[PDB]
Paper text:
The IRG1 protein, also known as CAD, is over-expressed during immune responses and catalyzes the production of itaconate, which functions as an immunometabolite possessing antibacterial, antiviral, and immunoregulatory activities. In mammalian systems, itaconate production is catalyzed by immune responsive gene 1 (IRG1), which is known as an LPS-inducible protein highly expressed during the inflammation phase of pathogen infection. Itaconate, the decarboxylated product of cis-aconitate (an intermediate metabolite in the TCA cycle), is a small immunometabolite that can control innate immunity and possesses antibacterial and antiviral activity. Our findings indicate that IRG1 exist as a dimer in solution.
The detected asymmetric unit contained two molecules (A and B), which comprise the functional unit of IRG1. Following the refinement and model building process, the model of molecule A was constructed from residues 5 to 463 and the model of molecule B was constructed from residues 4 to 460. The mouse IRG1 structure revealed that it is composed of two distinct domains, a helical domain and lid domain. Structural analysis in this area showed that K152 and D153 from A1 loop formed hydrogen bonds with S381 from A2 loop.
Author numbering:
A (entry chain B): 4 to 296, 301 to 460
B (entry chain A): 5 to 120, 124 to 295, 303 to 461
The structure:
Amino acid sequence: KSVTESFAGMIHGLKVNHLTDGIIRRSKRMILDSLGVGFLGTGTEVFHKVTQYSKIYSSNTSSTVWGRPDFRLPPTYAAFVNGVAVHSMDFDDTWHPATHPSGAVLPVLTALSEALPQTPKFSGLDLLLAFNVGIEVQGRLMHFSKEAKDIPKRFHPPSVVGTLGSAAAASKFLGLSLTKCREALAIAVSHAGAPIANAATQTKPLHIGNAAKHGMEATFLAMLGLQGNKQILDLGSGFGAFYANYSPEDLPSLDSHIWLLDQQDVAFKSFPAHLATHWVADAAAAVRKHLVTLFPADHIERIVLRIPDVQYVNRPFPDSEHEARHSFQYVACASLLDGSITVPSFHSQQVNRPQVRELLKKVKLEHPPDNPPSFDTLYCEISITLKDGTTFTERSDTFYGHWRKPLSQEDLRNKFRANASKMLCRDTVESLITVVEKLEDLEDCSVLTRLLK
Amino acid sequence: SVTESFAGMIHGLKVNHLTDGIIRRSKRMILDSLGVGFLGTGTEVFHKVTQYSKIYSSNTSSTVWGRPDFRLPPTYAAFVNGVAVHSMDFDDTWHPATHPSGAVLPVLTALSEALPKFSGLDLLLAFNVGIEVQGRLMHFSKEAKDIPKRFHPPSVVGTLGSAAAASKFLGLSLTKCREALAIAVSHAGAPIANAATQTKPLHIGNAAKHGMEATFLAMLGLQGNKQILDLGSGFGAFYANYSPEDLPSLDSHIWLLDQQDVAFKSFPAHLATHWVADAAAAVRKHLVPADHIERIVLRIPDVQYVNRPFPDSEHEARHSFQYVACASLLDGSITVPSFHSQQVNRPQVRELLKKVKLEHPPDNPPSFDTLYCEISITLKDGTTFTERSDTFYGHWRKPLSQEDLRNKFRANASKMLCRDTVESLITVVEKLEDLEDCSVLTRLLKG
């Protein structure tokens, strides 16, 4: 047969009986983190704009807009705005090969659980199964091109593999047949193109939104019988259009299948910025220990960041939240000036402080050959020379939260608490934590969705 | 920057910049698009996209061309109407390769209805702005001159052209036009493989839809990359060897449509097969005998997604060099019903399809501007006949006359509309220049 048919086979064939306790732990962590960052993102300008746009549409079915119990959107637009919320602050999870896999799946399954209830109630295990199918389809697909393991320079993966992950999760959750799962994937491929250039702008979050949206839309068109190319995932003129040196492979038998999450964990972010800057901040946080026992900003000779050549996060003078989130230089100098980087660190009011500008003017980037542009092998080394000639240097190979040194469950819960506390009552936050941690045992998925408002 | 140059051109151009040529050609393009859309509203693809779209409703709405019994939001109205226009791949063709009219006209129509007076000149201005933007974008990559092999141009340049036309028609500021383009870029990716199947029409639909959506998001103030058209990591992500250039100053600007006409199709198939049919129609003149032929050799470029020696369905038949050749030989002509399943899988067609050999000489590159088709038929007794078509009637080198294009419109639109309504549409489009309000044209689409 074909690789495309293999993907349809994996989506259709996988059952709750194939889920492992490891992927269930990782899935519950991913879901809790995604909900927290979404709730936080509901306060952004981007989420406001996408909800003001979406509100003009209405349907016979509708779904919750996270944190805002006063209005509902069609399931498509609800998933759209919720994915925007999770990716509104570049604060959701990161995986390897490079993508942001949770934001494109969870809002879709939530909207479907509300919008299209099955005659048998949806269970937490059904949500986990569809979630892991989407997470598996993306990533399993990314291993068909080596460049997917590097930080992207052409297309933004969450719009490419995230869209097909959405389609796979929706097809699984609703219960589509083998060939309709295939057709949902083939249709989603024609909704999957978006460039990396918009990463530093107000548009970037919509890459998750549409990824959540379009996949669902493809599934709907697949249910109506709309057909696509039977070999869309193993043609260079099909899905392979998004990757250089595309090299697809058949999927393994379910008897020999191993979930990707059981072998490759996700990284969780501590502050809302590009993952590469999490190395920068860490290195900066170390070197500041030799300078501060307030930072002596008035008399610093220079700041040197040894960091790989990722141009779209090379921003010596960012103006907005979004540019600061994609700025090596701002993250380094802000960590040096304040002593830590958190959410308010990326407010444009804070980014444009005169101390930030004067210290920022001193930041030099250096790209040594030994460190490649990849979240798995990237490092950051920071050197600060004083006007008196003294030079200090510290290096970060792995930061707390990276898949090599993951956040503890307590720290991930506390991130969730701090984020959700702007939208949810305390008791709602604690109950939602409980429900997600015990999601595998949840007889009725409604319990989770009813807490998102 | 080039991006700012596009925003400048879109905002700056006025009705007074419209030329006699681009108006004549725009009226031809619009009439053809309406006819082919009405024809396409009877297809399964239109059914699928309207059964999907009907679930959405908004404060404003717009006409569904073949189904006046309900209304859609202008977004979904443009979606399904563009689908109808591209439902059987019988839209027009332009150079560099794209299908620029199908992605633009439904958007301007839905906007004139949903979000009100717009004049025929305002419609023509926004339409030509979209067409111009598509042309200028395609001139930034060499492969745009060729028949596509990775992305489907109407989903890439058509999306930004739609966004430009919508932004122009609604009246967005300079920077909001720029932002509409930057947002549209993030909605613009679709591969050529789905060209050979039932999904293909949606590439126009989404191109009409997403462009409009981008404009709406721009109107709300959503920002994108201000130099999206100057980055290979931006719009250039869709092209090999992307090399953008500034647009000429309005002091020296020339419309592209005024220099490069569009080709109009005679039968619903990929434009390349229009060479094949023409050549085939010639060679049978020396024969008119399906059972007396040794072989059929069809010289034609290496375009794999129209290389289907044994098609299964409607969509493969529309993308089959071999089927077009064999149907032309058997019937003497190709018409719309020629692509029905019972006509594709008939035994005479199969007996000839088994005989078709393709040859790809260097003289044939995969490009609509330099393509030719040469067909040779050898009989079992050794007799060989050869005929060649370098340009077919309807190609921009031999464009369809007004009589033939009007008759195409009549034949197609009459499937859905009362023929007197068809004549009224002929007059209104022919006289669009003097039309006080677009309402007159859109009312005729109620029928």
